Amino acid sequence: DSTLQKARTKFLQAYEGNMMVRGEGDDIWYQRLWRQLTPETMEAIVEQSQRFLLPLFRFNQ
DNA sequence: TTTTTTTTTTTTGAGCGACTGCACTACAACGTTGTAGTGCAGTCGCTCTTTTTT
Numbered sequence: 723d724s725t726l727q728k729a730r731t732k733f734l735q736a737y738e739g740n741m742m743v744r745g746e747g748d749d750i751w752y753q754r755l756w757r758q759l760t761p762e763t764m765e766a767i768v769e770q771s772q773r774f775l776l777p778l779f780r781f782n783q
Numbered sequence: 784t785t786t787t788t789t790t791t792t793t794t795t796g797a798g799c800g801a802c803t804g805c806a807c808t809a810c811a812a813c814g815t816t817g818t819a820g821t822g823c824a825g826t827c828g829c830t831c832t833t834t835t836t837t
Contacts, residue, residue: 740796741831
């Protein structure tokens with residue numbers, strides 16, 4: 723549960739950044755699809771990133 | 784004085800302060816070895832209000 727909460731914290735930190743760094747969610751291409759980040763679309767993005775971005779960190783050294 | 788065209792994004796926080804690991808000597812227990820304090824280095828939280836006057 724601790725890693726499942728820290729991953730949600732990192733996802734909310736990288737999607738919507740602080741008041742000094744522009745986050746990834748502040749973009750004209752993501753606001754057209756959804757206006758508010760629902761947890762269902764968040765889990766869909768998590769599943770797609772686990773399906774595709776896994777060999778990025780699997781072969782990293 | 785006449786006239787020619789062209790579709791590609793990129794970037795952005797760092798100093799303050801603590802936690803822990805590794806080393807190194809000072810000093811007491813058993814010349815050598817275990818306990819304690821300090822310093823250097825890598826890693827990690829955090830954080831930067833409030834508003835209205837013709």
